[PDB]
Write a structure and sequence with these properties.
Two copies of one chain form a homodimer.
Chain A: E1 2-3, E2 10-15, E3 18-24, E4 32-33, E5 43-49, E6 52-66, E7 69-77, E8 84-85, H1 87-90, E9 96-98
Parallel strand pairs in A: 3-8, 4-7
Antiparallel strand pairs in A: 2-3, 2-6, 5-6, 6-7
The complex binds the ligand Cc1c(O)cccc1C(=O)N[C@@H](CSc1ccccc1)[C@H](O)CN1C[C@H]2CCCC[C@H]2C[C@H]1C(=O)NC(C)(C)C.
Ligand 1UN sits between chains B (25, 27-30, 32, 47-50, 80-82, 84, 86) and A (23, 25, 27-30, 32, 47, 49-50, 81-82, 84, 86).
Chain lengths: 99, 99
């Protein structure tokens, strides 16, 4: 799959038995999902974007299926308006920028 | 150029006679630079990221040289902590995501 950038690079994910849409985001160090319940224990974390900071819950070794490719990594959960797949997960699916 | 995502995808830009480093950001609709003086007249704009909103100045038809590729487009100027090259400029340089 080659994805051009004329539209947002949204992909379908499967995480915790749920189907979501998420944005492939090269400008994000981390992966950030809207509120959802996840197994097992987490740690509080602040992350900064443009315009300020949000509080999130850090879950490690969480299974995610991104466009049919499985990856396990750290997933942050909190009040983001868009599901974000960051570089931590993108490297696991062999995802590159090209030009 | 193929860019893997193990590190931030930072590139050198030239804009308004100045050299800067900027992040190639698939998760950004717009291009956002820290405070700098630019030719032309501008319009006020609010943009939202994670954790809130910032006020920026919208400059159109601005020349930018991104990793040696010229592009002209809308550049937003304001209190972003990182220079961000968004999709609007990335399409102009033939930039794709691949995996
Ligand atoms: C800059 C920009 C636009 O011009 C237009 C639309 C969105 C954005 C925007 O802020 N996008 C961001 C993701 S968050 C997001 C929020 C709303 C919609 C889509 C994505 C960037 O892609 C990533 N963004 C780039 C960059 C922005 C300036 C501050 C430092 C980083 C923070 C980083 C980021 O947010 N990282 C998290 C791990 C917290 C997710």
């Amino acid at each position: 799959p080659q994805i051009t950038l004329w539209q947002r690079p949204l992909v379908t994910i499967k995480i915790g038995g749920q189907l979501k849409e998420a944005l492939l985001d090269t400008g994000a160090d981390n992966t950030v999902l809207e509120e959802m319940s996840l197994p097992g224990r987490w740690k509080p974390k602040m992350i900064g974007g443009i315009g300020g900071f949000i509080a999130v819950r850090q879950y490690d070794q969480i299974l995610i299926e991104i466009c049919g490719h499985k990856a396990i990594g750290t997933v942050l959960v909190g009040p983001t308006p868009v599901n974000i797949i960051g570089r931590n997960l993108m490297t696991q699916i062999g995802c590159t920028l090209n030009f």
